[PDB]
Amino acid sequence: DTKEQRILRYVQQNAKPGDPQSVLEAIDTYCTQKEWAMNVGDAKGQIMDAVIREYSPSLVLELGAYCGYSAVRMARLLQPGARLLTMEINPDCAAITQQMLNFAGLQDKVTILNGASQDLIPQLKKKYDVDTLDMVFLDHWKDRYLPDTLLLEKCGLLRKGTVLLADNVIVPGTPDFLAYVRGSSSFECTHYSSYLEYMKVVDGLEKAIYQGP
Ligand SMILES: Nc1ncnc2c1ncn2[C@@H]1O[C@H](CSCC[C@H](N)C(=O)O)[C@@H](O)[C@H]1O
Ligand SMILES: Oc1cc(-c2ccc(F)cc2)cc2cncnc12
Ligand SMILES: [Cl-]
Ligand SMILES: [Cl-]
Ligand SMILES: [Mg+2]
C-alpha cells in the first residue's frame, strides 16, 4: 500500500464518521507521528479557516486535492447550500479524496473533478454550470499557479472580489505567480506568514483579491 492509502485507513480507524474535525485531527496526528505528507496542515489550515469565515464563499474552486485534507477543511466551514469543486490530476488521489469526503460526511458539498486543471477550467462554465468563482485555493504544482490564474481570468471565471488563496508561496515557492500578482493592479495582495505543514520551516499563504480588469 501507499502512504495515501495508509492516511485514509488511519482516518477510518481513528476518527469519527461524519465528524470533519476528528478527520483533520487524525490526518494531522498521522502525518506528525508516522509519515509526512503535503496536506496544508493545521498551522496554515488555521489561517485558511480565518479567511473562509471572513468571506463565507458560496462557490470555491480547489486546485490540487491529494487526500482531501484541505477539501474537508474548507467544506466543513461552508454554509448550507455552498459548494466546493476540487480538481485532481492523479486518479488514485481523486479516489482517496472521495473516500475521505465520504467518511467526513461532506460529500454532498464537494465535487471532485479527476483531470488536469488546465483542461478542466475551460469546462467549468458549460459543463459544470459555473458563472463566477467566489474563492480559489491554489495548491497544485507550483508552475501552474500563474498559468492557471491567467486562464481563470481568460475564461471569465473571476469577478470583482474573487479571493485567490495560494499555498506554498515560500516553500516550494511560486516565484512567477507571486511577482505577478504583487505587481498587478488587478490584484490586492496580503501575505500570511506561517510554517510548512508538520515542520519548523517557514512557509506562507498569499491572498490575492481580483479587482477586475
Ligand atoms: N495541473 C493539475 N491539475 C490538477 N491537479 C494537479 C495538477 N498538478 C498537480 N496536481 C495535484 O495537486 C496535488 C498537490 S497536493 C494538494 C494538497 C491539498 N490541497 C491539501 O492541502 O490537502 C497532488 O495531489 C497533485 O496530483
Ligand atoms: O504543501 C506542499 C508542500 C510541498 C513540499 C514538498 C517537499 C518539501 F521538501 C517541502 C514542501 C509540495 C507540495 C506540492 N503540491 C501542493 N502542496 C505542496
Ligand atoms: Cl511542486
Ligand atoms: Cl502543521
Ligand atoms: Mg500545499
PDB file of C-alpha atoms and ligand atoms in Angstrom:
ATOM      1  CA  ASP A   1       0.000   0.000   0.000  1.00  0.00           C
ATOM      2  CA  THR A   2       0.804   3.656  -0.452  1.00  0.00           C
ATOM      3  CA  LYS A   3       1.211   6.419   2.079  1.00  0.00           C
ATOM      4  CA  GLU A   4      -2.053   7.892   0.851  1.00  0.00           C
ATOM      5  CA  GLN A   5      -3.898   4.601   1.438  1.00  0.00           C
ATOM      6  CA  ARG A   6      -2.384   4.441   4.934  1.00  0.00           C
ATOM      7  CA  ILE A   7      -3.618   8.007   5.679  1.00  0.00           C
ATOM      8  CA  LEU A   8      -7.150   7.054   4.645  1.00  0.00           C
ATOM      9  CA  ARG A   9      -7.142   3.854   6.656  1.00  0.00           C
ATOM     10  CA  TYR A  10      -5.838   5.721   9.700  1.00  0.00           C
ATOM     11  CA  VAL A  11      -8.670   8.236   9.424  1.00  0.00           C
ATOM     12  CA  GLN A  12     -11.253   5.398   9.088  1.00  0.00           C
ATOM     13  CA  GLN A  13      -9.913   3.762  12.251  1.00  0.00           C
ATOM     14  CA  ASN A  14      -9.169   6.846  14.367  1.00  0.00           C
ATOM     15  CA  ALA A  15     -11.749   9.437  13.534  1.00  0.00           C
ATOM     16  CA  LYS A  16     -15.487   9.564  13.947  1.00  0.00           C
ATOM     17  CA  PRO A  17     -17.707   9.150  10.819  1.00  0.00           C
ATOM     18  CA  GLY A  18     -19.404  12.385   9.924  1.00  0.00           C
ATOM     19  CA  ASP A  19     -17.081  14.461  12.123  1.00  0.00           C
ATOM     20  CA  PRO A  20     -14.811  16.570   9.871  1.00  0.00           C
ATOM     21  CA  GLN A  21     -12.812  17.933  12.824  1.00  0.00           C
ATOM     22  CA  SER A  22     -11.879  14.410  14.005  1.00  0.00           C
ATOM     23  CA  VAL A  23     -10.801  13.591  10.394  1.00  0.00           C
ATOM     24  CA  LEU A  24      -8.427  16.610  10.298  1.00  0.00           C
ATOM     25  CA  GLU A  25      -7.032  15.723  13.696  1.00  0.00           C
ATOM     26  CA  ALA A  26      -6.470  12.135  12.638  1.00  0.00           C
ATOM     27  CA  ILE A  27      -4.667  13.197   9.449  1.00  0.00           C
ATOM     28  CA  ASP A  28      -2.560  15.763  11.374  1.00  0.00           C
ATOM     29  CA  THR A  29      -1.625  13.210  14.033  1.00  0.00           C
ATOM     30  CA  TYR A  30      -0.653  10.512  11.463  1.00  0.00           C
ATOM     31  CA  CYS A  31       1.395  12.969   9.455  1.00  0.00           C
ATOM     32  CA  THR A  32       3.156  14.324  12.566  1.00  0.00           C
ATOM     33  CA  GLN A  33       3.926  10.940  14.166  1.00  0.00           C
ATOM     34  CA  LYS A  34       4.237   8.487  11.236  1.00  0.00           C
ATOM     35  CA  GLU A  35       4.731   9.909   7.766  1.00  0.00           C
ATOM     36  CA  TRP A  36       4.987  13.494   6.478  1.00  0.00           C
ATOM     37  CA  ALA A  37       2.522  14.373   3.747  1.00  0.00           C
ATOM     38  CA  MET A  38       1.772  17.510   1.684  1.00  0.00           C
ATOM     39  CA  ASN A  39      -1.503  18.455   3.392  1.00  0.00           C
ATOM     40  CA  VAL A  40      -1.881  22.154   4.028  1.00  0.00           C
ATOM     41  CA  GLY A  41      -1.696  21.229   7.767  1.00  0.00           C
ATOM     42  CA  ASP A  42      -3.034  22.831  10.886  1.00  0.00           C
ATOM     43  CA  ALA A  43      -0.776  25.948  11.065  1.00  0.00           C
ATOM     44  CA  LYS A  44      -1.707  27.135   7.589  1.00  0.00           C
ATOM     45  CA  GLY A  45      -5.139  25.461   7.996  1.00  0.00           C
ATOM     46  CA  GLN A  46      -5.963  27.864  10.772  1.00  0.00           C
ATOM     47  CA  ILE A  47      -5.222  30.864   8.509  1.00  0.00           C
ATOM     48  CA  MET A  48      -7.396  29.261   5.776  1.00  0.00           C
ATOM     49  CA  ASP A  49     -10.198  28.832   8.296  1.00  0.00           C
ATOM     50  CA  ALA A  50      -9.992  32.565   9.206  1.00  0.00           C
ATOM     51  CA  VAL A  51     -10.187  33.503   5.506  1.00  0.00           C
ATOM     52  CA  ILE A  52     -13.055  31.158   4.800  1.00  0.00           C
ATOM     53  CA  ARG A  53     -15.044  32.525   7.751  1.00  0.00           C
ATOM     54  CA  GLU A  54     -14.346  36.083   6.675  1.00  0.00           C
ATOM     55  CA  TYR A  55     -15.713  35.684   3.127  1.00  0.00           C
ATOM     56  CA  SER A  56     -18.287  32.855   3.583  1.00  0.00           C
ATOM     57  CA  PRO A  57     -17.797  31.852  -0.093  1.00  0.00           C
ATOM     58  CA  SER A  58     -20.743  30.222  -1.880  1.00  0.00           C
ATOM     59  CA  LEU A  59     -18.589  28.553  -4.598  1.00  0.00           C
ATOM     60  CA  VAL A  60     -14.945  27.592  -4.042  1.00  0.00           C
ATOM     61  CA  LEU A  61     -12.568  26.037  -6.502  1.00  0.00           C
ATOM     62  CA  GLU A  62      -9.612  23.999  -5.248  1.00  0.00           C
ATOM     63  CA  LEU A  63      -6.630  23.159  -7.422  1.00  0.00           C
ATOM     64  CA  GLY A  64      -4.992  20.036  -6.081  1.00  0.00           C
ATOM     65  CA  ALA A  65      -6.879  17.680  -3.762  1.00  0.00           C
ATOM     66  CA  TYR A  66      -4.381  14.972  -2.786  1.00  0.00           C
ATOM     67  CA  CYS A  67      -6.031  13.042   0.110  1.00  0.00           C
ATOM     68  CA  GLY A  68      -8.863  15.573   0.728  1.00  0.00           C
ATOM     69  CA  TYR A  69      -7.392  17.315   3.817  1.00  0.00           C
ATOM     70  CA  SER A  70      -7.921  20.842   2.544  1.00  0.00           C
ATOM     71  CA  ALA A  71     -11.243  19.962   0.970  1.00  0.00           C
ATOM     72  CA  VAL A  72     -12.512  18.679   4.340  1.00  0.00           C
ATOM     73  CA  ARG A  73     -11.019  21.755   5.974  1.00  0.00           C
ATOM     74  CA  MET A  74     -12.831  24.228   3.697  1.00  0.00           C
ATOM     75  CA  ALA A  75     -16.029  22.209   3.175  1.00  0.00           C
ATOM     76  CA  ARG A  76     -16.699  21.919   6.932  1.00  0.00           C
ATOM     77  CA  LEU A  77     -16.892  25.681   7.166  1.00  0.00           C
ATOM     78  CA  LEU A  78     -19.113  26.240   4.128  1.00  0.00           C
ATOM     79  CA  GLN A  79     -22.703  27.460   4.749  1.00  0.00           C
ATOM     80  CA  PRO A  80     -25.655  25.304   3.768  1.00  0.00           C
ATOM     81  CA  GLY A  81     -26.002  25.028   0.027  1.00  0.00           C
ATOM     82  CA  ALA A  82     -22.456  26.418  -0.598  1.00  0.00           C
ATOM     83  CA  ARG A  83     -20.174  24.176  -2.735  1.00  0.00           C
ATOM     84  CA  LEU A  84     -16.557  23.210  -3.399  1.00  0.00           C
ATOM     85  CA  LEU A  85     -15.219  21.909  -6.645  1.00  0.00           C
ATOM     86  CA  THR A  86     -11.818  20.312  -6.376  1.00  0.00           C
ATOM     87  CA  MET A  87      -9.569  19.303  -9.291  1.00  0.00           C
ATOM     88  CA  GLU A  88      -7.160  16.440  -9.067  1.00  0.00           C
ATOM     89  CA  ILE A  89      -4.987  15.019 -11.841  1.00  0.00           C
ATOM     90  CA  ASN A  90      -3.985  11.776 -10.167  1.00  0.00           C
ATOM     91  CA  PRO A  91      -6.866   9.208 -10.192  1.00  0.00           C
ATOM     92  CA  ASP A  92      -5.559   7.348  -7.131  1.00  0.00           C
ATOM     93  CA  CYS A  93      -5.666  10.607  -5.124  1.00  0.00           C
ATOM     94  CA  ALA A  94      -9.084  11.501  -6.536  1.00  0.00           C
ATOM     95  CA  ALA A  95     -10.313   8.124  -5.194  1.00  0.00           C
ATOM     96  CA  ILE A  96      -8.693   8.782  -1.777  1.00  0.00           C
ATOM     97  CA  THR A  97     -10.209  12.256  -1.664  1.00  0.00           C
ATOM     98  CA  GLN A  98     -13.697  10.986  -2.470  1.00  0.00           C
ATOM     99  CA  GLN A  99     -13.443   8.370   0.303  1.00  0.00           C
ATOM    100  CA  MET A 100     -12.116  10.919   2.749  1.00  0.00           C
ATOM    101  CA  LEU A 101     -15.004  13.272   1.987  1.00  0.00           C
ATOM    102  CA  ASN A 102     -17.478  10.428   2.303  1.00  0.00           C
ATOM    103  CA  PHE A 103     -16.086   9.395   5.672  1.00  0.00           C
ATOM    104  CA  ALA A 104     -16.325  13.001   6.849  1.00  0.00           C
ATOM    105  CA  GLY A 105     -19.947  13.316   5.658  1.00  0.00           C
ATOM    106  CA  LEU A 106     -19.124  16.248   3.375  1.00  0.00           C
ATOM    107  CA  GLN A 107     -19.768  14.501   0.056  1.00  0.00           C
ATOM    108  CA  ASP A 108     -22.891  16.497  -0.773  1.00  0.00           C
ATOM    109  CA  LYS A 109     -20.905  19.759  -0.519  1.00  0.00           C
ATOM    110  CA  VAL A 110     -17.999  18.711  -2.698  1.00  0.00           C
ATOM    111  CA  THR A 111     -17.482  17.598  -6.289  1.00  0.00           C
ATOM    112  CA  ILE A 112     -14.089  16.075  -7.062  1.00  0.00           C
ATOM    113  CA  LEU A 113     -13.177  16.506 -10.735  1.00  0.00           C
ATOM    114  CA  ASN A 114     -10.472  13.956 -11.824  1.00  0.00           C
ATOM    115  CA  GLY A 115      -8.340  15.663 -14.576  1.00  0.00           C
ATOM    116  CA  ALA A 116      -5.772  18.461 -15.157  1.00  0.00           C
ATOM    117  CA  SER A 117      -6.783  21.913 -14.022  1.00  0.00           C
ATOM    118  CA  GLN A 118      -5.728  23.416 -17.385  1.00  0.00           C
ATOM    119  CA  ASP A 119      -8.184  21.048 -19.167  1.00  0.00           C
ATOM    120  CA  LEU A 120     -10.984  21.280 -16.654  1.00  0.00           C
ATOM    121  CA  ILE A 121     -11.057  25.068 -16.059  1.00  0.00           C
ATOM    122  CA  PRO A 122     -12.360  25.833 -19.576  1.00  0.00           C
ATOM    123  CA  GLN A 123     -15.210  23.369 -18.986  1.00  0.00           C
ATOM    124  CA  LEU A 124     -16.497  24.954 -15.778  1.00  0.00           C
ATOM    125  CA  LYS A 125     -18.994  27.349 -17.404  1.00  0.00           C
ATOM    126  CA  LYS A 126     -20.627  24.986 -19.889  1.00  0.00           C
ATOM    127  CA  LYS A 127     -20.174  21.540 -18.304  1.00  0.00           C
ATOM    128  CA  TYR A 128     -20.342  22.428 -14.594  1.00  0.00           C
ATOM    129  CA  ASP A 129     -22.704  25.405 -14.868  1.00  0.00           C
ATOM    130  CA  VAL A 130     -20.400  27.827 -13.117  1.00  0.00           C
ATOM    131  CA  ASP A 131     -20.804  31.586 -13.530  1.00  0.00           C
ATOM    132  CA  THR A 132     -18.051  33.082 -11.434  1.00  0.00           C
ATOM    133  CA  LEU A 133     -15.990  31.799  -8.551  1.00  0.00           C
ATOM    134  CA  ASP A 134     -16.006  33.307  -5.032  1.00  0.00           C
ATOM    135  CA  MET A 135     -12.699  31.816  -3.908  1.00  0.00           C
ATOM    136  CA  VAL A 136      -9.934  29.704  -5.456  1.00  0.00           C
ATOM    137  CA  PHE A 137      -7.444  27.703  -3.323  1.00  0.00           C
ATOM    138  CA  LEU A 138      -4.273  27.140  -5.414  1.00  0.00           C
ATOM    139  CA  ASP A 139      -2.339  24.194  -4.103  1.00  0.00           C
ATOM    140  CA  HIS A 140      -1.301  22.031  -7.078  1.00  0.00           C
ATOM    141  CA  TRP A 141       2.042  22.069  -8.830  1.00  0.00           C
ATOM    142  CA  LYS A 142       3.744  25.436  -8.289  1.00  0.00           C
ATOM    143  CA  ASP A 143       4.434  26.033 -12.007  1.00  0.00           C
ATOM    144  CA  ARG A 144       0.715  26.020 -12.675  1.00  0.00           C
ATOM    145  CA  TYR A 145      -0.279  28.875 -10.333  1.00  0.00           C
ATOM    146  CA  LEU A 146       0.384  31.652 -12.812  1.00  0.00           C
ATOM    147  CA  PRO A 147      -0.795  29.932 -15.988  1.00  0.00           C
ATOM    148  CA  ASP A 148      -3.996  28.786 -14.279  1.00  0.00           C
ATOM    149  CA  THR A 149      -4.758  32.178 -12.792  1.00  0.00           C
ATOM    150  CA  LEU A 150      -4.455  33.763 -16.267  1.00  0.00           C
ATOM    151  CA  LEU A 151      -6.658  31.001 -17.632  1.00  0.00           C
ATOM    152  CA  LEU A 152      -9.277  31.607 -14.953  1.00  0.00           C
ATOM    153  CA  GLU A 153      -9.380  35.286 -15.963  1.00  0.00           C
ATOM    154  CA  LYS A 154      -9.475  34.384 -19.707  1.00  0.00           C
ATOM    155  CA  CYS A 155     -12.474  32.078 -19.123  1.00  0.00           C
ATOM    156  CA  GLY A 156     -14.498  34.791 -17.328  1.00  0.00           C
ATOM    157  CA  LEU A 157     -14.448  32.924 -14.016  1.00  0.00           C
ATOM    158  CA  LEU A 158     -13.178  35.738 -11.814  1.00  0.00           C
ATOM    159  CA  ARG A 159     -15.333  38.621 -10.639  1.00  0.00           C
ATOM    160  CA  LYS A 160     -14.597  41.731  -8.536  1.00  0.00           C
ATOM    161  CA  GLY A 161     -13.801  40.380  -5.096  1.00  0.00           C
ATOM    162  CA  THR A 162     -12.855  36.807  -6.049  1.00  0.00           C
ATOM    163  CA  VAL A 163     -10.362  35.608  -3.406  1.00  0.00           C
ATOM    164  CA  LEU A 164      -7.323  33.649  -4.591  1.00  0.00           C
ATOM    165  CA  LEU A 165      -5.572  31.892  -1.720  1.00  0.00           C
ATOM    166  CA  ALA A 166      -2.240  30.314  -2.628  1.00  0.00           C
ATOM    167  CA  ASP A 167      -0.384  27.740  -0.587  1.00  0.00           C
ATOM    168  CA  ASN A 168       3.328  27.247  -0.513  1.00  0.00           C
ATOM    169  CA  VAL A 169       4.395  30.700  -1.731  1.00  0.00           C
ATOM    170  CA  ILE A 170       7.633  30.344   0.220  1.00  0.00           C
ATOM    171  CA  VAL A 171       8.306  26.568   0.109  1.00  0.00           C
ATOM    172  CA  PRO A 172       8.451  25.184  -2.540  1.00  0.00           C
ATOM    173  CA  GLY A 173       7.672  28.726  -3.638  1.00  0.00           C
ATOM    174  CA  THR A 174       5.879  30.063  -6.700  1.00  0.00           C
ATOM    175  CA  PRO A 175       8.056  32.990  -7.789  1.00  0.00           C
ATOM    176  CA  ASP A 176       6.358  33.891 -11.116  1.00  0.00           C
ATOM    177  CA  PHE A 177       2.887  33.822  -9.551  1.00  0.00           C
ATOM    178  CA  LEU A 178       3.992  35.846  -6.564  1.00  0.00           C
ATOM    179  CA  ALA A 179       5.727  38.535  -8.589  1.00  0.00           C
ATOM    180  CA  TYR A 180       2.827  38.726 -10.961  1.00  0.00           C
ATOM    181  CA  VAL A 181       0.020  39.200  -8.530  1.00  0.00           C
ATOM    182  CA  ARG A 182       2.049  41.558  -6.296  1.00  0.00           C
ATOM    183  CA  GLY A 183       2.897  43.712  -9.315  1.00  0.00           C
ATOM    184  CA  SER A 184      -0.556  43.778 -10.850  1.00  0.00           C
ATOM    185  CA  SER A 185      -3.190  46.456 -10.286  1.00  0.00           C
ATOM    186  CA  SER A 186      -5.777  43.745 -10.902  1.00  0.00           C
ATOM    187  CA  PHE A 187      -4.955  42.073  -7.517  1.00  0.00           C
ATOM    188  CA  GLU A 188      -4.901  43.315  -3.956  1.00  0.00           C
ATOM    189  CA  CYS A 189      -2.411  41.042  -2.102  1.00  0.00           C
ATOM    190  CA  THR A 190      -1.721  40.153   1.519  1.00  0.00           C
ATOM    191  CA  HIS A 191       0.931  37.717   2.775  1.00  0.00           C
ATOM    192  CA  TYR A 192       0.260  35.429   5.735  1.00  0.00           C
ATOM    193  CA  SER A 193       3.489  34.028   7.121  1.00  0.00           C
ATOM    194  CA  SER A 194       3.245  30.562   8.605  1.00  0.00           C
ATOM    195  CA  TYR A 195       5.014  27.199   8.625  1.00  0.00           C
ATOM    196  CA  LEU A 196       5.325  24.290   6.311  1.00  0.00           C
ATOM    197  CA  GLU A 197       2.887  21.587   7.316  1.00  0.00           C
ATOM    198  CA  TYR A 198       4.235  19.398  10.152  1.00  0.00           C
ATOM    199  CA  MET A 199       7.651  21.183  10.069  1.00  0.00           C
ATOM    200  CA  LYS A 200       9.610  24.002  11.671  1.00  0.00           C
ATOM    201  CA  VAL A 201      10.158  25.590   8.279  1.00  0.00           C
ATOM    202  CA  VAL A 202       8.764  28.970   7.290  1.00  0.00           C
ATOM    203  CA  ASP A 203       6.132  28.961   4.663  1.00  0.00           C
ATOM    204  CA  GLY A 204       3.194  31.222   3.889  1.00  0.00           C
ATOM    205  CA  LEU A 205      -0.034  31.814   2.082  1.00  0.00           C
ATOM    206  CA  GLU A 206      -0.727  34.651  -0.319  1.00  0.00           C
ATOM    207  CA  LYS A 207      -4.224  36.098  -0.573  1.00  0.00           C
ATOM    208  CA  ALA A 208      -4.753  37.897  -3.919  1.00  0.00           C
ATOM    209  CA  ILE A 209      -8.111  39.556  -4.377  1.00  0.00           C
ATOM    210  CA  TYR A 210      -9.185  40.055  -8.029  1.00  0.00           C
ATOM    211  CA  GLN A 211     -10.150  43.677  -8.712  1.00  0.00           C
ATOM    212  CA  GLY A 212     -11.475  43.279 -12.281  1.00  0.00           C
ATOM    213  CA  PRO A 213      -9.607  44.366 -15.474  1.00  0.00           C
TER     214      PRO A 213
HETATM  215  N1  LIG B   1      -2.473  20.510 -13.159  1.00  0.00           N
HETATM  216  C1  LIG B   1      -3.038  19.838 -12.122  1.00  0.00           C
HETATM  217  N2  LIG B   1      -4.364  19.742 -12.084  1.00  0.00           N
HETATM  218  C2  LIG B   1      -4.983  19.057 -11.068  1.00  0.00           C
HETATM  219  N3  LIG B   1      -4.266  18.567 -10.030  1.00  0.00           N
HETATM  220  C3  LIG B   1      -2.924  18.644 -10.004  1.00  0.00           C
HETATM  221  C4  LIG B   1      -2.203  19.321 -11.062  1.00  0.00           C
HETATM  222  N4  LIG B   1      -0.922  19.270 -10.791  1.00  0.00           N
HETATM  223  C5  LIG B   1      -0.787  18.663  -9.627  1.00  0.00           C
HETATM  224  N5  LIG B   1      -1.977  18.272  -9.163  1.00  0.00           N
HETATM  225  C6  LIG B   1      -2.230  17.618  -7.912  1.00  0.00           C
HETATM  226  O1  LIG B   1      -2.030  18.614  -6.893  1.00  0.00           O
HETATM  227  C7  LIG B   1      -1.863  17.939  -5.628  1.00  0.00           C
HETATM  228  C8  LIG B   1      -0.967  18.821  -4.713  1.00  0.00           C
HETATM  229  S1  LIG B   1      -1.124  18.331  -3.012  1.00  0.00           S
HETATM  230  C9  LIG B   1      -2.705  19.091  -2.582  1.00  0.00           C
HETATM  231  C10 LIG B   1      -2.918  19.023  -1.055  1.00  0.00           C
HETATM  232  C11 LIG B   1      -4.319  19.510  -0.671  1.00  0.00           C
HETATM  233  N6  LIG B   1      -4.734  20.850  -1.215  1.00  0.00           N
HETATM  234  C12 LIG B   1      -4.330  19.646   0.811  1.00  0.00           C
HETATM  235  O2  LIG B   1      -3.896  20.636   1.367  1.00  0.00           O
HETATM  236  O3  LIG B   1      -4.769  18.712   1.487  1.00  0.00           O
HETATM  237  C13 LIG B   1      -1.429  16.497  -5.936  1.00  0.00           C
HETATM  238  O4  LIG B   1      -2.419  15.550  -5.493  1.00  0.00           O
HETATM  239  C14 LIG B   1      -1.275  16.533  -7.450  1.00  0.00           C
HETATM  240  O5  LIG B   1      -1.623  15.264  -8.104  1.00  0.00           O
HETATM  241  O1  LIG B   2       2.228  21.961   0.634  1.00  0.00           O
HETATM  242  C1  LIG B   2       3.048  21.382  -0.238  1.00  0.00           C
HETATM  243  C2  LIG B   2       4.366  21.135   0.165  1.00  0.00           C
HETATM  244  C3  LIG B   2       5.284  20.552  -0.766  1.00  0.00           C
HETATM  245  C4  LIG B   2       6.681  20.276  -0.331  1.00  0.00           C
HETATM  246  C5  LIG B   2       7.326  19.167  -0.778  1.00  0.00           C
HETATM  247  C6  LIG B   2       8.628  18.883  -0.348  1.00  0.00           C
HETATM  248  C7  LIG B   2       9.238  19.735   0.501  1.00  0.00           C
HETATM  249  F1  LIG B   2      10.515  19.413   0.943  1.00  0.00           F
HETATM  250  C8  LIG B   2       8.602  20.848   1.007  1.00  0.00           C
HETATM  251  C9  LIG B   2       7.323  21.099   0.552  1.00  0.00           C
HETATM  252  C10 LIG B   2       4.878  20.239  -2.032  1.00  0.00           C
HETATM  253  C11 LIG B   2       3.533  20.481  -2.458  1.00  0.00           C
HETATM  254  C12 LIG B   2       3.007  20.241  -3.779  1.00  0.00           C
HETATM  255  N1  LIG B   2       1.742  20.498  -4.122  1.00  0.00           N
HETATM  256  C13 LIG B   2       0.982  21.045  -3.090  1.00  0.00           C
HETATM  257  N2  LIG B   2       1.333  21.379  -1.878  1.00  0.00           N
HETATM  258  C14 LIG B   2       2.636  21.116  -1.552  1.00  0.00           C
HETATM  259 CL    CL B   3       5.636  21.485  -6.959  1.00  0.00          CL
HETATM  260 CL    CL B   4       1.058  21.955  10.795  1.00  0.00          CL
HETATM  261 MG    MG B   5       0.390  22.774  -0.291  1.00  0.00          MG
END
